[PDB]
Amino acid sequence: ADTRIGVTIYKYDDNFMSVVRKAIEQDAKAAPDVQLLMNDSQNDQSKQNDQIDVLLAKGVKALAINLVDCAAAGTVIEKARGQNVPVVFFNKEPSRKALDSYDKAYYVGTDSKESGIIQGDLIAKHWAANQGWDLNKDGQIQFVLLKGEPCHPDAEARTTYVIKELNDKGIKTEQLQLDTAMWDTAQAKDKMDAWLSGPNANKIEVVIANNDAMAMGAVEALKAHNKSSIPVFGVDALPEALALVKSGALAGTVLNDANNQAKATFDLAKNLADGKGAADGTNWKIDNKVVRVPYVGVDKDNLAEF
Ligand SMILES: OC[C@H]1O[C@@H](O)[C@H](O)[C@@H](O)[C@@H]1O
Ligand SMILES: [Ca+2]
């Protein structure tokens, strides 16, 4: 009797997707006529592909798919199409072409560039309020940047737009180091430690991370080098990160609204499973099959709101 919805999470121990997956499990458990079949793809698209085959064998009436491979939507769509099963992609955004190739494909996520713009504005505000951060007193921000996984739309947009926004405001920037840490805390700690062991160590004025997990790794490397005075900025507003905004270990972040992305994903998947319009009975705004949930800047000054 219960409507089965298959869900794949690209990697369960991704800090942000852990918040999302626990929220969507809660949403489903609050709803009686639904059974969620949850899968950890263990950061391997081949594993996810096999999981989708199994979910289809089990007759799920909708799929909610958080891709491993940024470009794998077409592969997933062709599996789903064979059984007329709708697919709500979430958090890793397929191409416009992929979404348009299947009348039952949808996406729930964010306007990726917005998070870069907000982060840049946040840095600009704090830079202006903390001119002691300009260690070499040249009027430019000497920064290092910890990038997410290449090709992930959030990594690409946050990396491009944080710097564009600063520069557009009239703040010149100098990139001292930039590398991916693949969204991961331990990789970011190791990378930041390398940078703090290299010739630019002393010159680094601001650490910019594409997410909070990498920001937290940087914070722990700075602590080990007795350089916690160097500001670090993140994205996601993870609970662990907000505690660092409060303690002063993290200068700022940006809410990536996991609870509403989870709810929208669930709501659309359940409507589609039921053969209804994707947004029926909800306030979600679907624009060409996409729901985007706003980001919100967070620092000590507005922390009491969160
Ligand atoms: O796809 C996973 C990534 O999604 C991004 O939107 C989040 O900001 C990251 O923390 C996360 O690692
Ligand atoms: Ca400077």
Tab-separated table of C-alpha atoms and ligand atoms in Angstrom:
chain	number	residue	atom	x	y	z
A	1	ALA	CA	0.000	0.000	0.000
A	2	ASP	CA	2.721	2.477	1.007
A	3	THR	CA	4.264	4.560	-1.759
A	4	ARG	CA	7.958	3.705	-2.105
A	5	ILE	CA	10.402	6.469	-2.986
A	6	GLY	CA	14.047	5.590	-3.724
A	7	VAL	CA	16.713	8.040	-2.586
A	8	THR	CA	20.445	8.036	-3.318
A	9	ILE	CA	22.830	10.258	-1.354
A	10	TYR	CA	26.179	10.688	-3.074
A	11	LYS	CA	28.137	10.113	0.128
A	12	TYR	CA	26.548	9.810	3.595
A	13	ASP	CA	29.437	11.406	5.457
A	14	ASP	CA	29.453	14.605	3.418
A	15	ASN	CA	28.693	17.084	6.240
A	16	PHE	CA	26.035	18.971	4.325
A	17	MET	CA	24.373	15.951	2.742
A	18	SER	CA	24.246	14.338	6.203
A	19	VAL	CA	22.015	17.234	7.299
A	20	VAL	CA	19.920	16.814	4.140
A	21	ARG	CA	19.495	13.039	4.408
A	22	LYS	CA	18.509	13.142	8.086
A	23	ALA	CA	15.975	15.876	7.294
A	24	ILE	CA	14.397	13.956	4.438
A	25	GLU	CA	14.157	10.816	6.620
A	26	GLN	CA	12.336	12.931	9.217
A	27	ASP	CA	9.985	14.373	6.565
A	28	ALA	CA	9.101	10.864	5.409
A	29	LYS	CA	8.597	9.447	8.932
A	30	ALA	CA	6.157	12.291	9.664
A	31	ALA	CA	4.177	11.101	6.588
A	32	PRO	CA	2.383	7.709	6.877
A	33	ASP	CA	1.684	6.563	3.304
A	34	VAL	CA	5.382	6.730	2.301
A	35	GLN	CA	8.336	4.343	2.565
A	36	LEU	CA	11.806	5.843	1.800
A	37	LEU	CA	14.437	3.455	0.483
A	38	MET	CA	17.698	5.252	1.381
A	39	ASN	CA	21.066	4.489	-0.201
A	40	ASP	CA	24.629	5.662	0.457
A	41	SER	CA	26.445	5.692	-2.893
A	42	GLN	CA	29.821	5.867	-1.087
A	43	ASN	CA	31.069	8.520	-3.496
A	44	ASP	CA	31.038	6.144	-6.468
A	45	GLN	CA	28.725	6.682	-9.463
A	46	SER	CA	29.019	3.007	-10.466
A	47	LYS	CA	27.668	2.052	-7.025
A	48	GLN	CA	24.864	4.593	-7.395
A	49	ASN	CA	23.954	3.227	-10.830
A	50	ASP	CA	23.626	-0.283	-9.415
A	51	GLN	CA	21.577	1.100	-6.520
A	52	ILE	CA	19.156	2.746	-8.964
A	53	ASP	CA	18.756	-0.592	-10.797
A	54	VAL	CA	17.824	-2.198	-7.485
A	55	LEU	CA	15.385	0.587	-6.580
A	56	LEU	CA	13.663	0.163	-9.972
A	57	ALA	CA	13.486	-3.624	-9.433
A	58	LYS	CA	11.729	-2.823	-6.134
A	59	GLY	CA	9.080	-0.795	-7.993
A	60	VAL	CA	9.729	2.621	-6.436
A	61	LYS	CA	7.237	5.183	-7.773
A	62	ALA	CA	9.776	8.063	-7.710
A	63	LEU	CA	13.526	8.550	-7.421
A	64	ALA	CA	15.296	11.374	-5.569
A	65	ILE	CA	18.890	11.345	-6.823
A	66	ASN	CA	21.929	13.168	-5.444
A	67	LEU	CA	24.473	12.370	-8.151
A	68	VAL	CA	28.046	11.342	-7.499
A	69	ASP	CA	29.354	12.309	-10.962
A	70	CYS	CA	28.347	15.895	-11.824
A	71	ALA	CA	27.587	14.851	-15.443
A	72	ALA	CA	25.803	11.510	-14.896
A	73	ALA	CA	22.146	12.715	-15.080
A	74	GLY	CA	21.721	11.247	-18.591
A	75	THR	CA	22.672	7.771	-17.353
A	76	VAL	CA	20.182	7.970	-14.499
A	77	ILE	CA	17.408	9.370	-16.745
A	78	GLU	CA	17.682	6.457	-19.156
A	79	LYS	CA	17.285	3.956	-16.311
A	80	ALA	CA	14.225	5.815	-14.972
A	81	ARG	CA	12.634	6.346	-18.396
A	82	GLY	CA	12.433	2.568	-18.915
A	83	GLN	CA	9.909	2.264	-16.061
A	84	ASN	CA	8.194	5.679	-16.392
A	85	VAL	CA	9.606	6.689	-12.993
A	86	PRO	CA	9.962	10.394	-12.176
A	87	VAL	CA	13.339	11.634	-10.973
A	88	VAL	CA	13.946	14.584	-8.671
A	89	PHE	CA	17.648	15.350	-8.871
A	90	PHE	CA	18.947	17.319	-5.885
A	91	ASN	CA	22.026	19.283	-4.789
A	92	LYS	CA	24.214	18.376	-7.818
A	93	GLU	CA	22.569	20.158	-10.734
A	94	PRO	CA	22.263	18.413	-14.142
A	95	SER	CA	22.602	20.323	-17.401
A	96	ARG	CA	19.577	22.084	-18.874
A	97	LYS	CA	19.695	19.548	-21.748
A	98	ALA	CA	19.560	16.558	-19.396
A	99	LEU	CA	16.613	17.977	-17.473
A	100	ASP	CA	14.788	18.739	-20.747
A	101	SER	CA	15.428	15.252	-22.137
A	102	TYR	CA	12.874	13.630	-19.806
A	103	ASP	CA	9.431	15.070	-19.020
A	104	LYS	CA	9.573	13.573	-15.508
A	105	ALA	CA	13.023	14.997	-14.525
A	106	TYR	CA	13.165	17.829	-11.961
A	107	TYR	CA	15.851	19.532	-9.875
A	108	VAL	CA	15.879	20.896	-6.315
A	109	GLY	CA	18.848	22.962	-5.194
A	110	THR	CA	20.068	26.523	-5.109
A	111	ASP	CA	21.205	29.436	-7.260
A	112	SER	CA	24.878	28.523	-6.935
A	113	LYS	CA	26.278	31.946	-7.860
A	114	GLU	CA	24.183	33.602	-5.127
A	115	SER	CA	26.267	31.879	-2.446
A	116	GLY	CA	29.500	33.235	-4.008
A	117	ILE	CA	28.039	36.736	-4.207
A	118	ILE	CA	26.824	36.628	-0.593
A	119	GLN	CA	30.160	35.243	0.623
A	120	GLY	CA	32.015	38.009	-1.255
A	121	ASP	CA	29.787	40.718	0.215
A	122	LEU	CA	30.291	39.228	3.653
A	123	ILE	CA	34.063	39.264	3.223
A	124	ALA	CA	33.889	42.870	1.938
A	125	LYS	CA	31.887	43.946	4.985
A	126	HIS	CA	34.245	42.275	7.447
A	127	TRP	CA	37.353	43.468	5.594
A	128	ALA	CA	36.119	47.071	5.905
A	129	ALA	CA	35.408	46.536	9.637
A	130	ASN	CA	38.755	44.801	10.351
A	131	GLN	CA	41.518	46.699	8.525
A	132	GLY	CA	44.043	44.958	10.814
A	133	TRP	CA	43.433	41.963	8.521
A	134	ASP	CA	45.366	43.754	5.769
A	135	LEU	CA	48.662	42.415	7.101
A	136	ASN	CA	50.861	44.020	4.412
A	137	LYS	CA	48.821	47.255	4.342
A	138	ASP	CA	48.544	47.262	0.501
A	139	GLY	CA	44.753	47.662	0.299
A	140	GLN	CA	44.432	44.252	-1.420
A	141	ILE	CA	43.199	40.962	0.031
A	142	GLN	CA	45.909	38.300	-0.150
A	143	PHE	CA	43.847	35.116	0.001
A	144	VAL	CA	43.975	31.365	-0.301
A	145	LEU	CA	40.966	29.442	-1.596
A	146	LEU	CA	39.864	25.890	-0.801
A	147	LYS	CA	37.741	24.724	-3.697
A	148	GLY	CA	35.092	22.033	-3.771
A	149	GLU	CA	35.170	19.174	-6.226
A	150	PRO	CA	35.886	20.333	-9.775
A	151	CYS	CA	32.798	20.432	-12.020
A	152	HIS	CA	30.400	20.659	-9.097
A	153	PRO	CA	28.273	23.715	-9.967
A	154	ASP	CA	28.544	25.075	-6.399
A	155	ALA	CA	32.346	24.762	-6.414
A	156	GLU	CA	32.661	26.516	-9.754
A	157	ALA	CA	30.232	29.334	-8.973
A	158	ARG	CA	31.376	29.973	-5.400
A	159	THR	CA	35.004	30.141	-6.558
A	160	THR	CA	34.294	32.503	-9.468
A	161	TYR	CA	31.754	34.773	-7.802
A	162	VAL	CA	33.339	35.353	-4.385
A	163	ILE	CA	36.303	36.993	-6.128
A	164	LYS	CA	34.208	38.734	-8.819
A	165	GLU	CA	32.036	40.253	-6.103
A	166	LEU	CA	35.010	41.539	-4.107
A	167	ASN	CA	36.631	42.963	-7.252
A	168	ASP	CA	33.324	44.529	-8.428
A	169	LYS	CA	33.106	46.337	-5.068
A	170	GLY	CA	36.590	47.795	-5.647
A	171	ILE	CA	38.571	45.353	-3.519
A	172	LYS	CA	41.581	44.057	-5.405
A	173	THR	CA	42.556	40.493	-4.537
A	174	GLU	CA	45.711	38.421	-4.890
A	175	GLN	CA	45.407	34.650	-5.072
A	176	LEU	CA	48.350	33.225	-3.106
A	177	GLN	CA	47.166	29.604	-3.291
A	178	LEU	CA	44.138	27.764	-4.654
A	179	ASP	CA	43.396	24.053	-4.768
A	180	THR	CA	40.556	21.636	-4.338
A	181	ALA	CA	40.013	19.836	-1.049
A	182	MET	CA	37.031	17.946	-2.481
A	183	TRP	CA	34.531	19.328	0.058
A	184	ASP	CA	36.348	17.437	2.839
A	185	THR	CA	37.626	18.593	6.247
A	186	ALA	CA	40.674	16.319	6.467
A	187	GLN	CA	41.810	17.149	2.932
A	188	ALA	CA	41.405	20.856	3.692
A	189	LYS	CA	43.398	20.599	6.933
A	190	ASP	CA	46.217	18.887	5.050
A	191	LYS	CA	46.157	21.460	2.220
A	192	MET	CA	46.062	24.433	4.584
A	193	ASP	CA	48.898	22.931	6.612
A	194	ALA	CA	50.958	22.662	3.402
A	195	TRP	CA	50.233	26.304	2.618
A	196	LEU	CA	51.235	27.298	6.167
A	197	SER	CA	54.496	25.383	5.590
A	198	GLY	CA	55.260	27.127	2.280
A	199	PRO	CA	56.659	30.534	1.328
A	200	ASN	CA	53.266	32.320	1.368
A	201	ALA	CA	52.418	31.235	4.901
A	202	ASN	CA	53.053	34.694	6.413
A	203	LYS	CA	51.339	36.601	3.608
A	204	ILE	CA	47.943	34.892	3.832
A	205	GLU	CA	45.348	37.430	5.018
A	206	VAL	CA	42.041	35.633	4.411
A	207	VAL	CA	41.091	31.987	3.906
A	208	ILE	CA	38.094	31.487	1.593
A	209	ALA	CA	36.500	28.029	1.501
A	210	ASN	CA	33.722	26.858	-0.804
A	211	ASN	CA	32.131	25.030	2.173
A	212	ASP	CA	32.134	24.852	5.955
A	213	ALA	CA	33.695	21.380	6.085
A	214	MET	CA	36.805	22.689	4.317
A	215	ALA	CA	36.703	25.936	6.360
A	216	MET	CA	36.780	23.830	9.538
A	217	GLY	CA	39.873	21.967	8.316
A	218	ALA	CA	41.571	25.282	7.658
A	219	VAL	CA	40.629	26.490	11.140
A	220	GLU	CA	42.312	23.452	12.678
A	221	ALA	CA	45.484	23.924	10.591
A	222	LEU	CA	45.630	27.611	11.601
A	223	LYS	CA	45.212	26.576	15.280
A	224	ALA	CA	48.127	24.129	14.994
A	225	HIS	CA	50.290	26.942	13.563
A	226	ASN	CA	49.182	29.466	16.219
A	227	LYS	CA	47.591	31.589	13.467
A	228	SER	CA	43.946	31.631	14.546
A	229	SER	CA	43.979	35.420	14.008
A	230	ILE	CA	43.649	34.752	10.243
A	231	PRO	CA	39.948	34.910	9.284
A	232	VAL	CA	38.264	31.965	7.543
A	233	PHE	CA	34.988	32.086	5.577
A	234	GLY	CA	32.760	29.153	4.636
A	235	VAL	CA	29.433	28.182	3.102
A	236	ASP	CA	26.587	26.049	4.529
A	237	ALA	CA	26.025	27.294	8.100
A	238	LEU	CA	26.407	23.765	9.474
A	239	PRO	CA	25.598	23.651	13.217
A	240	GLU	CA	29.288	22.901	13.929
A	241	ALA	CA	30.238	25.973	11.873
A	242	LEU	CA	27.780	28.328	13.642
A	243	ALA	CA	29.481	27.394	16.928
A	244	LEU	CA	32.747	28.586	15.352
A	245	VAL	CA	31.086	31.839	14.246
A	246	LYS	CA	30.112	32.290	17.928
A	247	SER	CA	33.607	31.382	19.223
A	248	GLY	CA	35.239	33.652	16.611
A	249	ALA	CA	37.124	30.742	14.965
A	250	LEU	CA	35.070	31.243	11.764
A	251	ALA	CA	34.561	34.819	10.461
A	252	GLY	CA	31.421	34.116	8.434
A	253	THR	CA	29.413	31.607	6.451
A	254	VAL	CA	26.261	31.318	4.328
A	255	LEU	CA	23.194	29.203	5.105
A	256	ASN	CA	22.687	26.463	2.528
A	257	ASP	CA	19.167	25.581	3.584
A	258	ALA	CA	19.271	21.797	3.971
A	259	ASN	CA	15.899	21.565	5.722
A	260	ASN	CA	13.992	23.289	2.917
A	261	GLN	CA	15.903	21.504	0.145
A	262	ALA	CA	15.059	18.211	1.869
A	263	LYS	CA	11.403	19.217	2.204
A	264	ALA	CA	11.097	20.355	-1.415
A	265	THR	CA	12.800	17.195	-2.664
A	266	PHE	CA	10.451	15.048	-0.594
A	267	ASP	CA	7.322	17.021	-1.501
A	268	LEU	CA	8.018	16.920	-5.241
A	269	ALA	CA	9.019	13.258	-5.204
A	270	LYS	CA	5.850	12.294	-3.322
A	271	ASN	CA	3.584	14.305	-5.635
A	272	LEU	CA	5.263	12.765	-8.674
A	273	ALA	CA	5.021	9.273	-7.135
A	274	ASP	CA	1.287	9.961	-6.671
A	275	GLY	CA	0.961	11.006	-10.359
A	276	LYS	CA	0.184	14.606	-9.411
A	277	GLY	CA	1.728	17.902	-10.516
A	278	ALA	CA	5.137	18.212	-8.865
A	279	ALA	CA	4.220	21.294	-6.761
A	280	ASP	CA	0.569	20.382	-6.037
A	281	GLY	CA	-0.497	21.379	-2.512
A	282	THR	CA	2.784	23.189	-1.827
A	283	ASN	CA	4.190	26.704	-2.053
A	284	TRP	CA	7.289	25.615	-4.022
A	285	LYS	CA	7.983	27.743	-7.075
A	286	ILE	CA	9.029	25.485	-9.931
A	287	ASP	CA	10.673	27.406	-12.770
A	288	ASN	CA	11.300	25.179	-15.797
A	289	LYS	CA	11.309	22.092	-13.542
A	290	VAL	CA	13.716	23.606	-10.975
A	291	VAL	CA	13.234	24.706	-7.362
A	292	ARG	CA	15.948	26.956	-5.930
A	293	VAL	CA	16.112	27.599	-2.204
A	294	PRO	CA	17.719	30.928	-1.151
A	295	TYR	CA	21.063	31.263	0.624
A	296	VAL	CA	21.446	33.673	3.578
A	297	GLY	CA	24.687	35.263	4.879
A	298	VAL	CA	25.606	34.543	8.511
A	299	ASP	CA	28.082	36.231	10.857
A	300	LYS	CA	28.272	37.174	14.570
A	301	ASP	CA	26.074	40.259	13.970
A	302	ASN	CA	23.036	38.231	12.850
A	303	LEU	CA	23.916	34.917	14.544
A	304	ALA	CA	21.198	35.490	17.180
A	305	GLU	CA	18.587	35.078	14.404
A	306	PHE	CA	19.739	31.493	13.665
B	1	LIG	O1	27.342	18.022	-3.255
B	1	LIG	C1	27.846	18.180	-1.933
B	1	LIG	C2	28.197	19.632	-1.613
B	1	LIG	O2	27.043	20.420	-1.804
B	1	LIG	C3	27.259	21.805	-1.582
B	1	LIG	O3	26.090	22.505	-1.906
B	1	LIG	C4	27.597	22.019	-0.110
B	1	LIG	O4	27.855	23.400	0.119
B	1	LIG	C5	28.825	21.196	0.242
B	1	LIG	O5	29.139	21.265	1.612
B	1	LIG	C6	28.658	19.740	-0.158
B	1	LIG	O6	29.912	19.107	0.038
B	2	CA	CA	46.982	42.955	1.747
